[PDB]
Design a protein around this ligand. Sequence first.
Ligand SMILES: *[C@H]1O[C@H](CO)[C@@H](O)[C@H](O)[C@H]1NC(C)=O
Lengths: 274, 8, 99
Amino acid sequence: GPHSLRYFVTAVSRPGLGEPRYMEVGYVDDTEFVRFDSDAENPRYEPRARWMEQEGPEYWERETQKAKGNEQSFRVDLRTLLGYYNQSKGGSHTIQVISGCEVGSDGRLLRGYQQYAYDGCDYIALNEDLKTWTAADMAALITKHKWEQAGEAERLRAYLEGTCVEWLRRYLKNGNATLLRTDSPKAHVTHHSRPEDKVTLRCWALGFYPADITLTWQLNGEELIQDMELVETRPAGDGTFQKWASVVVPLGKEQYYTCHVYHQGLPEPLTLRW
Amino acid sequence: SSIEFARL
Amino acid sequence: IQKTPQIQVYSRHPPENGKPNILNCYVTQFHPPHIEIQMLKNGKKIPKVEMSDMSFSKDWSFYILAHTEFTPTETDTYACRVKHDSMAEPKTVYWDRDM
Ligand SMILES: *[C@H]1O[C@H](CO)[C@@H](O)[C@H](O)[C@H]1NC(C)=O
């Protein structure tokens, strides 16, 4: 199916404590594969996935340079925004960026994205056409005027359609054993007593990959997505994920509720009861 | 590899 | 905008005394990004704690994972202590192996 390459970029200022902290974390799908943290003793662009061992030393040097270049240039962006917003020179502020592309099974570009945010709010973003920008406020409108004059969209489109897409293909190729694997969810149900003859039934899906999964509770064939409690799918520390969904049912009437787990690792969805 | 970001 | 962090503590495998496992502490939906996260074994700070899976959601709030290797016991208790500007007192969430 489709695959993606994403970079989450963060720059956080801290007046009185030195230069802004800068971070770059990269992912291929739901798998972290590279990272750069300017607060590390010796700030290097370092691999986060074992298959990234296939990249020569030149790759690491180049990326480490590009990253340090960004750490400096974002220091400049933080000061600039202070001016756009007429803000105090002594407060902490945050610039966030999500950058990357998405490709289908055949390896062609499906989507490209470049999104910035300031202090947790939409600032500017490249539209799906990869030609025009959308500014969230008057401050971003200034940036928009500059980027249009510099042909920034064009430069970003060449990157998305060429560079971004090409490394994504290379990453999937080198890390196929990892990225293209499918770990099947292991499910089970726990039971918990509640006040007034009611019990909480919890369905757990463990050790699955990729992250996308669906957990639904049923009663006589119908779903209960309405009175169902759950948690956003989460990482378990070894490259796999887990999730749980719960529903409150009448005591003694547990056997009438079944859990359904759908995942691309389950040729047939699981169905459990307590 | 991430793109070289442009100034705001 | 200031969002309070959600704190989830859980293990990779269903807990089984004497069997290697992994303890996770997923801290999510917070803002600003400055935050201190500490995993604890019987009130004592765990040293080898790896941070990972940092990212943001659609609304830009931060997500981060702290995890470490551990082997369960019928005595040991684990917790995750978090300090964040949106909270007066540091918050501690204990691992519930019966969840
Ligand atoms: C913000 O900066 C100062 C302090 O609030 C104020 O005098 C000024 O009018 C504000 N913004 C502008 C337009 O300079």
